[PDB]
Amino acid sequence: RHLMDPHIFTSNFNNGIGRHKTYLCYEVERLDDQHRGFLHNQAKNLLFYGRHAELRFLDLVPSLQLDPAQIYRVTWFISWSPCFSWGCAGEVRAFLQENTHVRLRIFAARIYDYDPLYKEALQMLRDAGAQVSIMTYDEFKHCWDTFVDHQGCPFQPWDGLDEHSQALSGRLRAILQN
DNA sequence: GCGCTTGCGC
Ligand SMILES: [Zn+2]
């Protein structure tokens, strides 16, 4: 019942233009959807050091009360591919290792290649047993339906959503193909 | 506010 502003979503998860911010929408499904929601990064503003959207998720993981003797799948739809350089990639892996009853699924709207260590981040997450993928129309539409406060208005894709989505999917497969 | 947007400039 905490929903995102339409303009926020469409100007953040768009895959042709970027923002100086990151959003992460998450779901938790037990296996044999318990919790959902979304958050954004804390901006580094020295005049703090910032906190990436990934690390904020791990911070709230205790509040989700995951039964240690049950199996969960966690899904992120994240506006930027996770970084390596600021340590997001390492910490997620560390968390996955220390838990192991959690299985993770990550869809990114665009690749954070500003980090020149982006290839190592994605491959490091894949090796940890995360699924790393590019968001398509269906994942955008599902996030729209599930987290955006649309007031009953169905998802309207932006121009060239698919060209971009395929081009990025192409890039990511090349990276993970090792 | 204001811009252009892979927080920073003004
Ligand atoms: Zn990061």
Numbering used by the authors: 10 to 41, 49 to 63, 66 to 196
Provide excerpts from the study.
Here we reveal the structural basis of competitive inhibition of wildtype APOBEC3A by hairpin DNA bearing 2′-deoxy-5-fluorozebularine in place of the cytidine in the TC substrate motif that is part of a 3-nucleotide loop. The hydroxyl group at C4 is coordinated to the Zn2+ center and is derived from the water/hydroxide ion bound to the Zn2+ in the substrate-free state. Tetrahedral coordination at the Zn2+ is completed by His70, Cys101, and Cys106.
The APOBEC3 family of enzymes (A3A-A3H) forms part of the innate immune response against viruses and transposons. Its single-stranded DNA C-to-U editing activity results in multiple mutagenic outcomes including signature single-base substitution mutations (isolated and clustered), DNA breakage, and larger-scale chromosomal aberrations. Here, we use X-ray crystallography to determine high-resolution structures of wildtype A3A/hairpin-inhibited complexes and demonstrate the underlying mechanism of inhibition.
